[PDB]
Amino acid sequence: FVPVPPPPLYPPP
Amino acid sequence: PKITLLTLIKTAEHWARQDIRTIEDSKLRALLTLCAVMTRKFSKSQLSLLCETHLRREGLGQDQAEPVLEVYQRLHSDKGGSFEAALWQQWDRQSLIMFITAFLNIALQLPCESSAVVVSGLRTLVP
Ligand SMILES: [Ca+2]
């Protein structure tokens, strides 16, 4: 089993 | 409407031009299917460039390369829409919208094959 990768983290403005 | 290559491209072009931020979830689900199908039109060798282009498009750090590439790789190798369905279930709507928007912004302009030999041959045919 391979978990779904997390979505990309965007830089905070 | 049969799902030919050209129909796929025309569909992608249409939705690339839409602002999908307020789209119905049912349509967003179908767009994820579209992105998965379109991803599989790329040679495996092109997934790294797809990832890199996505990062640049979205102003993402290189530390985000691993998860983004993994998504593209697992869509590319997906069978029976298993990973696609897991991705849809796990991710939040906003993340999905952003990813799909980015993909549709880059997928139509990126070469689907990288092989130098292949690219050379095909160049002599392009009208
Ligand atoms: Ca767009």
Q: Is A12 on the interface with B (CB under 8 A)?
A: no
Rounded Cα distance between B97 and A6, Å, is 14
Nearest to B99 by CA among B31, B43, B40, B7: B31
CB contact at 8 A, B62 and A9: no
Task: List the resolution, Å.
Answer: 1.5
DSSP for chain A reads: --PPPPPPPPPP-
Contact A4 B90 (CB under 8 A): yes
C-beta atoms surrounding B100 within 10 Å: 19
Tallying the residues shown for chain A, one arrives at 13
Q: Is B99 on the interface with A (CB under 8 A)?
A: yes
Question: Domain extents for chain B?
Answer: 1-127
Rounded Cα distance between B63 and B83, Å, is 22
User: Class assignment of domain B1-127?
Assistant: mainly alpha
Contacts of B84 in chain A (CB under 8 A): none
